[PDB]
Design a binder for this molecule. Structure first.
Ligand SMILES: Nc1ncnc2c1ncn2[C@@H]1O[C@H](COP(=O)(O)OP(=O)(O)NP(=O)(O)O)[C@@H](O)[C@H]1O
Ligand SMILES: Nc1ncnc2c1ncn2[C@@H]1O[C@H](COP(=O)(O)OP(=O)(O)NP(=O)(O)O)[C@@H](O)[C@H]1O
Ligand SMILES: Nc1ncnc2c1ncn2[C@@H]1O[C@H](COP(=O)(O)OP(=O)(O)NP(=O)(O)O)[C@@H](O)[C@H]1O
Lengths: 311, 311, 311
DNA sequence: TTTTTTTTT
DNA sequence: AAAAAAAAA
């Protein structure tokens, strides 16, 4: 939460600063987490300038060794937002954390985008209810976003729907490259008001249709790695929350399970957490954890009512 | 609805524009939704030209963050065409939406192509009746299209049959690759007069007989992903409506239902909606929803009269 | 009805053409309906050659969008051959269409092959009587074909039997693969004289005894899909007529009807029409429609006289 | 030296 | 029950 204007200090030119602004950098911490080469490659910058700049990023953000205790005390206050249902709150142990990346595993009709809606509204609850009190931006990439459902959840939690819709900064990606511009604009929007959550329904879906590899493929992974790193660039700074929804890739000639998310290893190593969603009978659905260091594997039911997620 | 001629501006060469025309691009928005690489790969184009071009696509079509409220106000006016019967209008909540992809699940004799006929006529009704007032193109791929039925529905809704048949741009695919050329020609036809609906009886049927995988298969999915993406390219621009009819693939060694549509995951993740059609006794048939974020699951009867869909 | 020699034009080598001849292709339209990959896979062909070839197939056969009206005007002239009895002519609304695939549903002693005989003779009637004036080829696969009955029908319609037998190109399949070679030879024979009708008594019967699946099965369906596609390749070109006779598969642990044709979904989705034949008392039999988009379900009697089909 | 994708009957 | 095949800096 530290604007570059604070770096308009110690002899840096304000127009040099406004050169820096165009990189999509808008906070001192973003400069602190910027690799030297990215900062060099942009034109009109001698490396010594970067010595000054990075010296200032160190000047504001400490980057040394830290006690495990202090880290624990700073871990004490992560919000971990409620999902809007109890059993998920038990699975996730209080729900999805801020400052992290999450994952929807499903085949279809698993209510993953549904959960994205309910989270999108429930971030706006007062913190006592677990909401981050943070405006929510929703990067849809299939156009499947439904305001009507947001009004339904608005009925569900008693807040006026108009207030809920006043936030929820919907955006509609098409090109794989477009998502990048949407990220830089996101970072541009982060400066003004503490947002709660980024959601992405199908970060991966564009990558199937565009990169018919291999390939390709080697380019596809090449792009995803940067995308996910940028998501870390946001999440490591402004908490809020990162949600990723993945289409599924069914194996052939496997054993006994015919699933696994597309995107290969690079997605898998990146996410702090992972989830998997099998349909039950009727509305009922089954969550099941993968790859969360915080938690033992667990599984649970939830119905998708008119209010969606519940019991 | 924005022709490339508007992009014949800001220093772009008119013959460069007429190079662009040949890509199947014919509208500014199509350029806006064009991935950078597809635009590069076509010959006679430096990437800087694409900087100009894309800069203009941004110059005409906004692509930034949007309020959920504004999206709601733009969601307020989607036509969602009547199906020509009341109970389906209740299931679908006013009928099939424009700007979307839909799905017929059936085994055979489920009247899916029947419904395609009735929709094909009923798009031509005045909007008060729910018709989009949009000419309809019908990409048949089994040759099963029957003008006679269109005359029957024409009796059903009192409009002269000749006027109905004056539209209905029937086209007869054979090769799997042929469907692609039919898509580019479709996009070419979109420029001239606002069409209502694309229909495809069996987008999938060619893919069985041609790709006897695996495979293949990995190529088959590779082709379908592009096909469906193109259908999104049309639907995200010109509304109208996309209808998909799928043959069924009966499981072996399953449990308890012996169905699921072919095409695997890639079809399933793509569609905004889904439908399923079990035969009842006599003419009567049963619709049942899958995978519509908008709607709770529901089911209903309808007879297939001489006028087809009704009660 | 367009021989490849017309494609012996625009720089194509005549020996390249005679390479093409060996594919079983013998008409320009067949090339037009040929998928790109099948044309590539055959040896001695660069893909650019296929660019030339397909460009010529487009050069002779239009493949663009068409008005529904024009399609109606071309639908106006389909012969729909008389079955040799009135009530069937009413059921089928003038009898079996050219350019289509048809289906015999029976258990045994339902006179399906009988009907195949009477059709086999009655195609030779003058068009005023509904005969296509087209030589008839009869692909038997159980050896049950009886010339004697053809002489009987010849008595029935007053034409000399010798003239009738002068056509009727009987062929006797054994292997499942053999039917394929018989198809390519059929296509080879199509060039010389407009034939009326292909008949196949038991396209499916070989598939039981050879593929004792599952399986198999997945291979069986894999083969049938190609077979049926080839039947479409013929029927979409040269009209005449396609007739399919199917043995029956009685269900176990069903409800209330213990039937359904073998071959699963893939046969079912393919046929333009379908028929079902229950024995009545004495000679009398009962036809009943399935899966004809053209027609409402109906049912009717007919006796199997010495002249077979009648009243 | 980097990089997994795909269900049918 | 039992089934392959797929490149490019
Ligand atoms: N009106 C409704 N009433 C009841 N349940 C509903 C209603 N609308 C949606 N649902 C439920 O929500 C599901 C929507 O599917 P969902 O999995 O949320 O979309 P998805 O996972 O994103 N699939 P995709 O189309 O690829 O995006 C339906 O299958 C129902 O279970
Ligand atoms: N000489 C005849 N006189 C009267 N009726 C006859 C005569 N020959 C045949 N039929 C009739 O035709 C039927 C022949 O059975 P049919 O159903 O035509 O053979 P199919 O259906 O092919 N059975 P399949 O042996 O498996 O091929 C007999 O059951 C009689 O009803
Ligand atoms: N003249 C008619 N009178 C009454 N009902 C009719 C008539 N014509 C068609 N139908 C009905 O419409 C159905 C046509 O099947 P339908 O499911 O529409 O074709 P389909 O689903 O595309 N099967 P396919 O052959 O693979 O394309 C028939 O089963 C009847 O229920």
């Amino acid at each position: 939460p530290q604007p570059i204007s604070r770096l308009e200090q110690c002899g840096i030119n304000a127009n040099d600063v406004k050169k820096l602004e165009e990189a999509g950098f808008h906070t001192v911490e973003a400069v602190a987490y910027a690799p030297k080469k990215e900062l060099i490659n942009i034109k009109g910058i001698s490396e010594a300038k970067a010595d000054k700049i990075l010296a200032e990023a160190a000047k504001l953000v400490p980057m040394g060794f830290t006690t495990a205790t202090e880290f624990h005390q700073r871990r004490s206050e992560i919000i971990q937002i409620t999902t809007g249902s109890k059993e998920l709150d038990k699975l996730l142990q209080g729900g999805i954390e801020t400052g992290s990346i999450t994952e929807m595993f499903g085949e279809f009709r698993t209510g993953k985008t549904q959960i994205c809606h309910t989270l999108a509204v429930t971030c706006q609850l007062p913190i006592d209810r677990g909401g981050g009190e943070g405006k929510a931006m929703y990067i849809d990439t299939e156009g499947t976003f439904r305001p009507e459902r947001l009004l339904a959840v608005a009925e569900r939690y008693g807040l006026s729907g108009s207030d809920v819709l006043d936030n929820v900064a919907y955006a509609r990606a098409f090109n794989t490259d477009h998502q990048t511009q949407l990220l830089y604009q996101a970072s541009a929007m982060m400066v003004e008001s503490r947002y709660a959550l980024l959601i992405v329904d199908s970060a991966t879906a564009l990558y199937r249709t565009d990169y018919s590899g291999r390939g390709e493929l080697s380019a596809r992974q090449m792009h995803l790695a940067r995308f996910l790193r940028m998501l870390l660039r946001l999440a490591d700074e402004f908490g809020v929350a990162v949600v990723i929804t993945n289409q599924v890739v069914a194996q052939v000639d496997g054993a006994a399970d015919p699933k696994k998310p597309i995107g290969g290893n690079i997605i898998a190593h990146a996410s702090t957490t992972r989830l998997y969603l099998r349909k039950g009978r009727g509305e009922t659905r089954i969550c099941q954890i993968y790859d969360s260091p915080c938690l033992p594997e667990a599984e649970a039911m939830f119905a998708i009512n008119a209010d969606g997620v519940g019991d």
